[PDB]
């Protein structure tokens, strides 16, 4: 439900519709 949307800082916006998180230590 809503899957794309606004998303958060760091959070990769991936070229399809989804979110990934992006904290490479």
């Given at each position: ?13 991936t ?11």
């Amino acid at each position: 439900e809503n899957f794309s949307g606004g998303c958060v800082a760091g959070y990769m916006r991936t070229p399809d519709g989804r979110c990934k998180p992006t904290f490479y230590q």
